[PDB]
């Protein structure tokens, strides 16, 4: 540009004959030198071209996955309005991925795949750590979709569109197939599915596979799916089976979605969320000191105890201040200033009542740089009064009742300290396991209201802690330092009556519910006095049951907990297996509606 400008302004101000001036010769020499530098431009441009084509052919699918992941995270907020992730959060994910490589390879071809897999896994972990369990399958499906799109692999766009828009599209009117083994709604689903060229002769195939009247309809169709989608890739087979089970048995759609995600990303892709939340490592490493730690919680399940136990374990100091009055705001500001100066942690309890003060808190937090080892914990309920600024600023952790009996036992055994459970005598561990089993059953029954319980009681961690305390103190009363107790001497009647009238029966209103709790306590707290082969429940009416582990130690009981199958039916709880069908179907329809919200954004 200097070339062109100088040449034009030199030619325009000659004020005479160009051929008669030596300054024109100087401009000629200038043009020659600048033509020489334009000549050597070409090799720099060629090296730029080879560099950019190398980096493109190396890491273009990675960047496409980057964009898709961040835009899915951005469009995620349309579901539950609670989580608002930010580009700073995504860049923290990248600083965690590209700089913390497990078993750190030196071969770039394997390192790129390692980075991609670790990215998908850590993205799901760090996002689903602050989401309800109803949406984890939706996020896993979105991650699987991004992996499939970024994969050489035939894109299943038409059949995914049909799967997402099956019930919405109008089906045939007046066409009714055979009612030999399927209902009218199943017939309508088959009619809608018949539009696909692959699923063309389904009307012929349902009567061709007459002997497969159990794998297609009824029974448990998760493992077995008849027919198929020419050779087909396993992912396409999974898609075809998912469409078939949506057409036939919409209840197990969640199970088919889970196994499709497992086949598309790994059988342990989303299995880390069933583990109890490891708050210590995430707080000490994954949280910047500026960023507050939001601990959202569903009603009836608080989260103060987790961080209080964390502070006690890590010997740190927390100035826990309850939010809700002006002097409360005053000591909150004083403790925040003192913490920034020193470094001790500060807790504000129930911040979901003063959004106007939360605005000033967020602006003050962004206006300062804190000490290195200082974390601010905020606890709140899930209500729309929480400011989106604060949600964007802070890392979001949700606290929900754990999904599954196995998960509940794992959380309970993580909560109960080893020194407490392993005290003398040797029956304390078995009694604590029985207590944890009882708590897991009575808390899992709350999901299937109004069958498991007539009302949504607050059977939380307070009841569990009180039951542990009363078991400990009655065992200390009945054991004068003995290393073992015969099962007859255990105060079974005392424990049953106390937990039925003071601890767990305190919240019980209906006499029928009180009778039901007495039924569980009587069935569970006898064990024929610690006899072997004690039947805990009956998982399937046909040749299946859950039995007492023979172990007599905490390690044995924990090991028995992790050996339980990942499958769970309400027959574990004692409910009929038909209790969860309508709820699971409704959750599947909610998943479909959520992905419909996702895809659309990509007179009276």
């Amino acid at each position: 540009r200097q070339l062109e400008k100088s040449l034009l302004q030199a030619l325009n101000e000659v004020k005479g004959r160009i051929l008669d001036d030596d300054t024109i010769i100087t401009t000629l020499e200038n043009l020659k030198r600048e033509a020489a530098e334009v000549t050597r431009k070409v090799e720099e441009t060629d090296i730029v071209m080879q560099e950019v084509e190398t980096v493109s052919q190396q890491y273009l699918p990675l960047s496409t996955a980057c964009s898709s992941i961040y835009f899915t995270m951005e469009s995620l907020k349309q579901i539950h309005f609670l989580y608002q992730y930010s580009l700073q959060f995504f860049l923290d994910i990248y600083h965690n991925v590209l700089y913390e490589n497990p078993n750190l390879v030196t071969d770039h071809t394997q390192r790129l795949s390692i980075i991609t897999k670790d990215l998908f896994q850590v993205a799901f972990n760090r996002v689903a750590r602050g989401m309800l369990h109803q949406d984890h399958i939706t996020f896993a499906m979105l991650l699987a979709r991004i992996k499939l799109k970024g994969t050489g692999e035939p894109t299943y766009d038409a059949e995914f569109q049909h799967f997402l828009r099956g019930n919405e599209i109008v089906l045939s009117a007046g066409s009714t197939p055979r009612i030999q083994g399927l209902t009218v709604e199943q017939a309508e689903a088959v009619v809608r599915l018949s539009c696909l060229p692959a699923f063309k002769d389904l009307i012929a195939k349902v009567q061709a596979d007459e002997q497969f009247g159990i794998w297609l309809d009824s029974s448990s169709p998760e493992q077995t799916v008849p027919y198929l989608w020419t050779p087909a890739t396993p992912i396409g087979q999974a898609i075809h089976r998912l469409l078939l089970i949506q057409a036939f048995r919409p209840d197990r759609l969640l199970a088919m979605a889970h196994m499709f995600v497992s086949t598309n990303l790994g059988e342990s892709f989303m299995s880390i969320m069933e583990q109890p939340l490891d708050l210590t490592h995430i707080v000490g490493t994954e949280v910047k000191p500026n960023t507050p730690v939001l601990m959202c919680s569903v009603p009836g399940y608080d989260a103060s105890g987790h961080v209080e136990d964390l502070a006690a374990e890590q010997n740190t100091q927390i100035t826990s201040i309850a939010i809700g009055s002006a002097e409360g705001f005053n000591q909150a500001d004083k403790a925040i200033n003192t913490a920034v100066k020193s470094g001790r942690w500060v807790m504000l309890k129930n911040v979901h009542l003063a959004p106007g003060w939360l605005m000033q808190l967020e602006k003050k937090l962004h206006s300062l740089q804190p000490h290195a080892c200082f974390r601010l914990f905020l606890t709140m309920e899930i209500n729309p009064k929480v400011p989106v600024n604060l949600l964007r600023a802070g890392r979001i952790f949700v606290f929900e009742p754990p999904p599954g009996v196995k998960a509940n036992m794992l959380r309970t055994f993580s909560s109960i300290p080893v020194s407490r459970i392993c005290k003398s005598p040797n029956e304390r561990a078995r009694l604590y396991f029985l207590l944890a089993w009882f708590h897991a059953i009575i808390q899992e029954r709350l999901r299937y209201a109004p069958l498991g319980w007539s009302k949504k009681y607050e059977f939380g961690e307070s009841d569990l802690r009180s039951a542990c305390d009363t078991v400990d103190t009655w065992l200390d009363d009945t054991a004068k330092g003995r290393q073992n107790i015969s099962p007859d001497k255990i105060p079974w009647s005392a424990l049953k009556t106390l937990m039925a009238q003071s601890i767990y029966g305190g919240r019980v209103d209906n006499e029928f519910d009180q009778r039901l709790l007495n039924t569980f306590l009587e069935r569970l707290f006898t064990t024929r006095s610690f006899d072997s082969e004690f039947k805990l429940a009956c998982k399937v009416d046909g040749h299946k049951d859950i039995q007492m582990p023979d172990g007599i130690r905490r390690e044995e009981f924990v090991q028995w907990v992790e050996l339980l199958p990942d499958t769970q039916t309400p027959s574990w709880l004692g409910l009929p297996n038909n209790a969860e069908r309508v709820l699971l179907t409704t959750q599947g329809v909610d998943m479909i509606s959520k992905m419909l919200k996702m895809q659309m954004l990509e007179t009276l």
Binding site: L7, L8, Q9, R17, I18, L19, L28
Partner: protein, 217 residues
């Protein structure tokens, strides 16, 4: 467009006649600025072309003088050979030969100048011919630039592109010509100020480029 976005689900934001007044002010300013820039560029081009035409004429005059006095030197050499007073004729022929050497050197430098400047002329003529067409599209192109620079500052990239495409379809349907083969960022931002922005911690994306253009204008 605002109503469509509101029904789609994003937050709508109010449109006021202050926007229209600002847009028409931007249209006037951009039309005046682009016309003035084109006029001064054409003036510079005309001065350069006139000077290079004068240089070509001087080249032709130098060639004619060189060949005429080369023939004169040949005639004088023949006369000196016939006369073979000889020393004076030899000195005169030597002076004429020195003059021929100097004029031939100047012709060589002028030829080098013409060869260097022919590539410049071969594009200056094209720009001069293209100026007549590009003068007519100024109205429509400045209209689009002003509408973009005064309206679409709140929407995202897709909605901005929708607005620009709608305005372009309207101007195509209204038989008004607009410069299609140019970027809306390139037409509004100069290269040096783009470099200064890139030095001043601005990201290298088109969105932030027109954001900086809005902040400047």
């Amino acid at each position: 467009a605002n109503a469509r976005l509101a029904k789609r689900g994003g937050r709508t934001m109010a449109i006021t006649p202050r926007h229209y007044l600002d847009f028409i002010n931007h249209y006037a300013n951009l039309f005046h600025e682009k016309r003035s820039e084109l006029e001064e560029q054409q003036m510079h081009l005309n001065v350069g072309l006139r000077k290079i035409k004068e240089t070509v004429d001087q080249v032709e005059e130098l060639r004619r003088d060189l060949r005429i006095k080369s023939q004169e030197l040949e005639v004088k050499n023949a006369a000196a050979n016939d006369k073979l007073e000889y020393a004076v004729l030899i000195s005169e022929a030597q002076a004429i030969k020195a003059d021929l050497a100097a004029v031939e050197a100047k012709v060589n430098r002028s030829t080098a100048l013409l060869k260097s400047l022919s590539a410049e002329r071969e594009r200056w003529e094209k720009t001069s011919e293209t100026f007549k067409n590009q003068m007519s599209t100024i109205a429509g192109d400045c209209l689009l630039s002003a509408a973009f620079i005064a309206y679409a500052g709140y929407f995202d990239q897709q909605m901005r592109q929708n607005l620009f495409t709608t305005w372009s379809h309207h101007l195509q349907q209204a038989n008004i010509q607009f410069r299609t083969d140019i970027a809306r960022t390139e037409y509004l931002s100069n290269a040096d100020e783009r470099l200064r922005w890139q030095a001043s911690s601005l990201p290298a994306d088109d969105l932030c480029t027109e954001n900086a253009i809005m902040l400047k204008r």
